């Protein structure tokens, strides 16, 4: 474990989420049909378990349009960063755009402190 790789991994996660957003921030209404579960708290790395659990539904929604390759990259990164917590979900749910923006925000938060 060390701080260079951790920092590089978070920036690559952040970028992958923005890539997804930009791909759809360009069937859009149908993709907005689906609601995603959201973290009640997301301040530190272990809270990425809330992201991991939602990656299978994310890939399903994206497949209504290279999805698998971007999602599996994100999955590999989320597992390293969260390391080796039971996710606590909020009661409000989010569209895919609200979902990506919350996790993009979360990444930016961790990165700036490093």
């Amino acid at each position, epitope marked *: 474990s060390s701080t260079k790789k951790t920092q590089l991994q978070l920036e690559h996660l952040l970028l992958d989420l923005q890539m997804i957003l930009n791909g759809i921030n360009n069937k859009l209404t149908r993709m907005l049909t689906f609601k995603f*579960y959201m973290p009640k708290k997301a301040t530190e790395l272990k809270h990425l378990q809330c992201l991991e659990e939602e990656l299978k539904p994310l890939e399903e929604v994206l497949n209504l349009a290279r999805p698998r390759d971007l999602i599996s990259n994100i999955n590999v990164i989320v597992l390293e960063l969260k390391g080796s917590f039971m996710c606590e979900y909020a009661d409000e749910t989010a569209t895919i755009v609200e979902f990506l923006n919350r996790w993009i925000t979360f990444c930016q938060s961790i990165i700036s402190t490093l």
Partner: single-chain antibody
Amino acid sequence: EVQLQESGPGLVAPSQSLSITCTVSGFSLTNYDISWIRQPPGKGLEWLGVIWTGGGTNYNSGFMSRLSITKDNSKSQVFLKMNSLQTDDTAIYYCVRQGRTPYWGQGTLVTVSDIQVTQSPSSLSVSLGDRVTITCKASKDIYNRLAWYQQKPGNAPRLLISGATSLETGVPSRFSGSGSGKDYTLTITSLQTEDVATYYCQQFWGTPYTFGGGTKLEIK
């Protein structure tokens, strides 16, 4: 304190329109989607449509052309309007806060003058005590977007389980939810006289938010 309250016209002529108002308190319509559901007397639950936080709507395919759902975020009110009425439209109408844990209104009676989801025994006829399983199987993966409900004659449905496996607050631990992917189960252990009811599953992975056919449980 979360509340939803449906106000309807009671009695309507068949050549007129039906309008119902759902007034909510304890939360904002800018943060939660609202579904409309109905239940013809003696029949199962059916989902009519939803109005999203951002203001768009999705409708049940069989009603779409005669329905209009709108809302006023500042008055905390949602409006259902239905045209071309039929005698078939006599039903109890409910509005539902559609978060991770759904919250139901009381339901107002109006009298007029796709992922498929298959629910297990249509009816169960048990002995006091006993352990029973009800299954709900979906056409495709629904990623734990599944709720179980209990309905007793003359009352609104009560939420037992949400997110496929999460026991709700105040619900006896004799009720348990399990499953993953496409097949989900409700288990009631050592069931009791208080458990005589009709039980329903509902999926909410994408619209329509379809209900199972119901399981009517009775001590026999």
